[PDB]
Amino acid sequence: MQRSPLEKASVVSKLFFSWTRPILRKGYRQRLELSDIYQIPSVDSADNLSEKLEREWDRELASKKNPKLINALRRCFFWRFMFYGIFLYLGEVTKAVQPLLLGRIIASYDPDNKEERSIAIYLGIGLCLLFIVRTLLLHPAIFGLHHIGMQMRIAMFSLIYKKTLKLSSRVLDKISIGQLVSLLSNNLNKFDEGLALAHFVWIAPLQVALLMGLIWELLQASAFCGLGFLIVLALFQAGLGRMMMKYRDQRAGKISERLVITSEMIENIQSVKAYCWEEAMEKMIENLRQTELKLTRKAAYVRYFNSSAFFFSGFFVVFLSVLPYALIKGIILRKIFTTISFCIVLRMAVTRQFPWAVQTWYDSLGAINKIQDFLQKQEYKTLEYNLTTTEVVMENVTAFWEGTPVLKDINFKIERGQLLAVAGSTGAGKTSLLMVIMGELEPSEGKIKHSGRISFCSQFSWIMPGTIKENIIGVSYDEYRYRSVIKACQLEEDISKFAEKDNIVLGEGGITLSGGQRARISLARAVYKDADLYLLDSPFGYLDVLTEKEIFESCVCKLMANKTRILVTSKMEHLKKADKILILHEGSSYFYGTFSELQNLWNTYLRYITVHKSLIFVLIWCLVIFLAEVAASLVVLWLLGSYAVIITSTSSYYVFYIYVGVADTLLAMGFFRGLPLVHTLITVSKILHHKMLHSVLQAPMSTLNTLKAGGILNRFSKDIAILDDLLPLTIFDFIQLLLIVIGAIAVVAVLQPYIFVATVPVIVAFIMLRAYFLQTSQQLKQLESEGRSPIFTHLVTSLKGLWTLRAFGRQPYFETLFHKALNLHTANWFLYLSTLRWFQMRIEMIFVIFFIAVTFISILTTGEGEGRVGIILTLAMNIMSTLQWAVNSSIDVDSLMRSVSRVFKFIDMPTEGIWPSGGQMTVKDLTAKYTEGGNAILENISFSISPGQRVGLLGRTGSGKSTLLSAFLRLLNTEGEIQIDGVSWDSITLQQWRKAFGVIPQKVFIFSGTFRKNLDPYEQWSDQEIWKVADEVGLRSVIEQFPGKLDFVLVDGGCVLSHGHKQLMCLARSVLSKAKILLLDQPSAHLDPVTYQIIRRTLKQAFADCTVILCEHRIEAMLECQQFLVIEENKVRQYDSIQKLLNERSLFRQAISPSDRVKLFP
């Protein structure tokens, strides 16, 4: 990693941006290697910028009664902002006085203008120095303003993230992931470049005042007829600005709603494929896209009229200011041309630079105001204590999640070292009681007293990205303690089977790990941490009886025999070792005491154009009208080769100069060509998104596991927004400029076939430099686009584990990890702007040297009369002033076309592509593996199932019970044959095979939507049928407690529901879509014994005969099975009776609960 070459560059080197030479010469030959990227300058590191802004923002909250974020920003950047403003202003004044020097030089070709001929050589020298000063004064000032805008964005992004970790739990309900992503993505590039346009709010009015005086000198009182037209045009554009912003505000809410739904369905794409819900998911996104595209089109029509206003004023402001003057007294051709030159600069300031500057202030101040509101939300109240009486106590505590209280009159007292066991039915408030103790649920009544040290283990196991060892140890590594908790948590057997022991890298969310393996990593993390109080929220959910027995008798009873701890349990064996017993029932304390007293009872462009058939026809239509206007202009112009206009023989060359000055209005695209072009370019974006979303759902699971959450969110938010807003109008601007250059050249090249010869050397010089620069610019843009992903990936994972983050105190670690993501994007983005500034500065210096040669050639060639060389050469250089604008606009088109190629890569991803009368199956030599180069988890598996019977799957956690179920649906690489009632595996299409199954996934899927929409996304059942099923699974009381019965919206993945309520929701789905063969993957994970009767009755009534393959861990669930399959060391054994199964195993028979042993062994 080399140091930045900017920090030791000489004064002249910084001026010409010469320090970018090493990378431009290397990127032209080879691909940019990882060592070519330089380190960022020390001034713009995220650590130093965040501290500077934080110091000023805290001064506002204490000094001023009315804090404003814009005052803190003003106190850090105002003087540098104004320093570059004055140099930018002097570069624009130089542009307005150019016609004073160039206008008199053009007059020296006329032999009548004897006064201009005597001093022509001095005007040429001054003109050359004027060009050089303007070049050296604009570009360094524009780069400095880009630098300031980058620093402001980095400082403010870090403040948002630091505030996020401190948000209260009540205000988290009102904030989704889609709001934060839209807040950051919209400003990721627009904010930096906005500061270069901000100064024209006061530069444009000063340019108008200067230019109006010079035009007054020529046309005494007729000049104001041109000002009255431009004032009316300025009011018109101001009105279109407010009309466009109204449509943009109505569109923001729908984009955030689409982003959250898109993120949810891709995170659990395996559950979507098992249910065969791809078509239903596409329909929901299609309806959201359609509503927001109508607002996008309406904003596009308004923005077209705002953009073409420049081209449609070039003739009507010149004509209106000259016509009253010519009618009273004849005007010569010399004055007509000079007025045209001054009006070009005037139209640019009024119709282009000023409305763009006003719009930037609306966007910038709007975002800073939006950020300030977020920075003032309610914060989490960390009620830490340094010390206590070493005992925990609650007194008459009542809490509300908002007409029923969650808890009421809950009181206990646990001394140091005692064990408290919390028990109760589903939804009784066991998890809420632990939230109250930690302080994430503030009680309305009562009080809490205990020490500030605490450790937590939730039902939902959160796995941070990184190594397994890094998950457990935290910050401080201890060799002795680490090896003890691993052995006590029974993780040694699983770790030894991994490719590289405990050094394997876990993805975000821990997808590659088993259901029960994640629970042990979460538990090992809690016991490794030293604390005074330990909270365990049902950690024995996805564990078999043998592993559960070993952990309970060696981890929580041996290692922590002297530490007070609270555990949630439903087993009656865990209640005997507890000193205190607490029973909960619907928020009220059912019992409190002890157990003893209880026992008393390029190809990219071509593909983009041809994706929509209607885009070709509009482009041909624009070409035919263009040829008709050029032909019309040629006939008129050829016809011209006291009066209102005075023209002489030696002054007739002004006709061509006037034509070139008004060609931008004769060739302007009217609304018959502008609106269809803009309308059709948005339909292309609609088609591309439909394909992109479609190909992601059909991709094979092996491909989808490589992608990251931030990688998908980068393409669906930033790349789609580019194709909707920026590209349609950038293309229109580029096409408009290209037509003007061709039309002006073609007309004058046939009437004077020497302008074309003299304009060749300038054209090829621009094209050769463009090809050289695009070799390296395209690679830096690609690296910058992919550098946004780590920013989005870290933002997603920090919200999913916010509660665990604050409990373990790892906030500083996550802030430092966020700054590395900011610095990685800064390196690529800063290097991209530097080379872009080099190109635009060289494209202007190349224009200058040619003009310097032309000016001196014309003056020396002009002899005693006329002088034709100068007339031709100076005309050609006037055309190249517009070609310079067209070349720079082509770079913007190419930069935005990088998003089109990134979308095309997601589209080209490979695809994975009464029969069951009885439902009997046959498996022959099935071999299953996740990666083709990985180990075979199962191998040579073979068994048969008779129709109507139930099969029980058994085995230790991590043995491969879920792998066998995934192999039936072909969710991984398989090498065998499965036969269902006669048909063959291979012959069937992959879509009819999956429809024969009913599935209950181990990980439940609830998306943001209505209760009825979650139970039935295809809308194929009436509400009478839905309620009938809802009674059989006991969900009626759950739905009625909400304001909308079957209408309530389940936001944030159904966070309103408890853990046991989600299991019943998945059982309802399987009953509704009644199929023959069922694959139930542990449907009673955390259900208490009383609630399990609901699963038991459903299994015998709803699934009358069927072919049920259970995958349960509880012994009670195996009394309803006729056949058994045991998975051990990658092999499947088969048994006919449960009593035979336990006879062979000696250790597993002892772990059986005595309550279950009597019925298992009568």
Ligand X SMILES: Nc1ncnc2c1ncn2[C@@H]1O[C@H](COP(=O)(O)OP(=O)(O)OP(=O)(O)O)[C@@H](O)[C@H]1O
Ligand Y SMILES: CC(C)(C)c1cc(C(C)(C)C)c(NC(=O)c2c[nH]c3ccccc3c2=O)cc1O
Ligand Z SMILES: CC(C)(CO)c1cc2cc(NC(=O)C3(c4ccc5c(c4)OC(F)(F)O5)CC3)c(F)cc2n1C[C@@H](O)CO
Ligand U SMILES: Cc1nn(C)cc1S(=O)(=O)NC(=O)c1ccc(-n2ccc(OCC(C)(C)C(F)(F)F)n2)nc1N1C[C@@H](C)CC1(C)C
Residue of 228, 214, 184, 179 lying closest to 350 (CA atoms): 228
Supply the minimum distance, in Å, between the C-beta of residue 96 and ligand CLR.
9
Is 309 assigned to a binding site? no
Number of other residues whose CB lies within 10 A of the CB of residue 760: 10
Q: Which amino acid is it at 343?
A: C
Q: In whole angstroms, how close is the CB of 18 to ligand U at the nearest point? A: 4
Out of ligand Y, ligand X, ligand Z, none, what residue 1057 binds, judged by CB under 5 to 8 A for its kind, is: ligand X
> Does the annotation place 957 within a ligand binding site?
yes
- Which single residue brings its beta carbon nearest to ligand CCCCCCCCCCCC? 201
Shortest separation between residue 915's beta carbon and ligand X, angstroms: 28
What b/e readout covers 972-982, taking b as 16+ CB neighbours within 10 angstroms?
bbbebebebbe
What's the CA gap between 956 and 958, in Å, rounded?
6
Q: Report 179-208 residues binding ligand CLR (CB under 6 A).
A: 206
Q: What is the CA radius of gyration of the chain?
A: 38
Contacts with ligand X, residue ranges (CB under 6 A) = 401, 406, 426-432, 511-517, 542, 930, 937, 955, 957-963, 1002, 1055-1060, 1086
Q: How far is the CB of 137 from ligand Z (least distance, A)?
A: 20
For 424, the enclosing helix (H) or strand (E) is: strand 419-424
Query: Which of ligand X, ligand Y, ligand Z, none lies near 81, with the C-beta cut-off 5 to 8 A by kind?
Result: ligand Z
Instruction: Determine, following the binding rule CB under 6 A, whether residue 308 of this chain makes contact with ligand Y.
Output: yes
Kindly tell me the number of DSSP H helices and DSSP E strands found in the chain.
45, 25
User: In the complex, what is the shortest distance from the CB of residue 217 to ligand CLR, in angstroms, rounded to a whole number?
Assistant: 4
Residues across the chain? 1162
Q: Is the Cβ of residue 994 or residue 1059 nearer to Mg ion in the bound state? A: 1059
Looking at the Cβ atoms of 202 and 591, the one nearer to ligand CCCCCCCCCCCC is: 202
Taking the C-alpha atoms of residue 262 and residue 289, their distance in angstroms, rounded to an integer, is 12
Annotated binding residue 429: yes
User: DSSP label at 1120?
Assistant: G
Does 626 sit near ligand Y (CB under 6 A)? no
* Smallest gap from residue 357 Cβ to ligand CLR (A): 17
One character per residue 57-96, x = contact with ligand Z (rule: CB under 6 A): -------------x--xx--xx--x---------------
Q: Say if residues 1016 and 1024 touch (Cβ distance below 8 Å).
A: no
Give CA angle at 1045 (1042, 1050), nearest 5°. Answer: 60
Looking at beta carbons only, is 93 or 783 nearer to ligand CLR? Answer: 93
Residues 189-228 that bind ligand Z (CB under 6 A): 194-195, 198
Q: How far is Cα 681 from Cα 1082, in angstroms, rounded to an integer?
A: 51
The half-sphere exposure of 477 on its side-chain side, counting CA atoms within 13 A, is 4
Range 519-549 burial, b when 16+ CB lie within 10 A, else e: bbbbbbbbbbbebbbbbbbbbbbbbbbbbbb
| Of residues 130-149, those binding ligand U (CB under 6 A) | 132, 135
Cβ-proximal residue to ligand X, closest one: 516
User: Closest distance between ligand U and the C-beta of residue 131, in Å?
Assistant: 8
User: Is residue 948 a known part of a binding site?
Assistant: no
**Please, what is the minimum distance in Å from the beta carbon of residue 85 to ligand CLR?**
14
401 is in an annotated binding site: yes
| 682 counts as binding ligand U under rule CB under 6 A | no
Interface size with ligand CCCCCCCCCCCC, residues (CB under 6 A): 3
The percent helix, strand, coil of the chain (3-state, each to 5) is: 60, 10, 30
What is the number of other CB atoms lying within 10 angstroms of the CB of residue 593?
12
Cβ at position 894, least distance to ligand U in Å: 18
CA atoms of 413 and 448, how far apart (whole Å): 11
Residue 670 in the binding site for ligand Y (CB under 6 A): yes
Cβ 654 vs Cβ 301: under 8 Å: no
- Give the one entry of ligand Y, ligand CLR, ligand Z, none that residue 1011 binds, where binding means its C-beta sits below a cut-off of 5 to 8 angstroms depending on kind: none
Nearer to ligand CLR, 210 or 852 (CB): 210
The CA distance from 728 to 711, in Å, is: 25
Exposed e or buried b per residue across 557-576, where buried means at least 16 C-beta atoms within 10 angstroms of its C-beta: eeeeeebbbbbbbbbeebbe
Sites for ligand CCCCCCCCCCCC among residues 358-417 (CB under 6 A)? 361
Write out the binding residues for Mg ion, residues 963-1022 only, by CB under 5 A.
1002
- 316 is an interface residue for ligand Y by CB under 6 A: no
Total site size for ligand Z, rule CB under 6 A: 12
* Residue 332 C-beta: closest distance to ligand CLR, Å: 19
Locus of tokens 């006729």 = 1122
Element spanning 1029, H or E = helix 1023-1032
Q: End-to-end CA distance of the chain, in Å?
A: 73
Rounded Cα distance, 209 and 595, in Å? 93
Does the protein bind ligand CLR through residue 209 (CB under 6 A)? yes
CB of 210 to ligand CLR, least distance (A): 5
3-class secondary structure for 8-59? Answer: HCCHHHHHHCHHHHHHHHHHCCCCCCCCCCCCCCHHHCHHHHHHHHHHHHHH
CB nearer to ligand Y: pick between 122 and 672: 672
Q: Which of residues 359-378 bind ligand Z (CB under 6 A)?
A: 360-361, 364
DSSP state of 1153: -
Name the DSSP class of 308.
Answer: T
Is 642 a known ligand-binding residue? no
Phi/psi at 1107 (5° precision):
-140, 90
Q: Does 309 bind ligand Y (CB under 6 A)?
A: yes
| Contact partner at residue 210 from ligand CLR, ligand Z, Mg ion, none, CB < 5 to 8 Å by partner kind | ligand CLR
The nearest distance, CB 793 to ligand X, in angstroms, is 19
List the one residue out of 1107, 1009, 1014, 1104 whose CA is nearest residue 1068.
Answer: 1014
Calculate helix-pair angle for 177-185, 789-800, nearest 10 degrees: 160
958 assigned binding-site residue: yes
Any bridge partners for residue 983, and if so which?
A: 980
Q: Which of 201, 637, 682, 857 binds ligand CCCCCCCCCCCC (CB under 6 A)?
A: 201
C-beta of 361: minimal distance to ligand CCCCCCCCCCCC in Å?
6
Residue 209, binding choice from ligand CLR, ligand CCCCCCCCCCCC, ligand Y, none, Cβ under 5 to 8 Å by partner class? ligand CLR
Q: Is 206 in the site for ligand CCCCCCCCCCCC (CB under 6 A)?
A: no
Q: How far is the CB of 57 from ligand X (least distance, A)?
A: 32
- Scan residues 121-150 and list those touching ligand Z (CB under 6 A): none
Among 83, 671, 885, 1161, binds ligand Y (CB under 6 A): 671
User: Is 716 in contact with 903 (CB distance < 8 Å)?
Assistant: no
**Contact residues for 1043 (Cβ-Cβ < 8 A; gap 6+):** none
> Which residue carries 């035979």 as its tokens?
1140
Residues in 837-866 that interact with ligand U by CB under 6 A:
842, 845-846, 848-849
Q: Please report, as ranges, the residues that interact with ligand CLR according to CB under 6 A.
A: 206, 209-210, 213-214, 216-217
Binding-site residue set: 401, 424-431, 459, 930, 955-962
Q: Please report, as ranges, the residues that interact with ligand Y according to CB under 6 A.
A: 305, 308-309, 312, 670-672
Q: Please report, as ranges, the residues that interact with ligand Z according to CB under 6 A.
A: 70, 73-74, 77-78, 81, 194-195, 198, 360-361, 364
Q: Please report, as ranges, the residues that interact with ligand CCCCCCCCCCCC according to CB under 6 A.
A: 201-202, 361
Binding-site residue set for ATP: 401, 424-431, 459, 930, 955-962
Q: Please report, as ranges, the residues that interact with ligand U according to CB under 6 A.
A: 18, 21, 24-25, 132, 135, 842, 845-846, 848-849
Q: Please report, as ranges, the residues that interact with Mg ion according to CB under 5 A.
A: 431, 515, 962, 1002, 1059
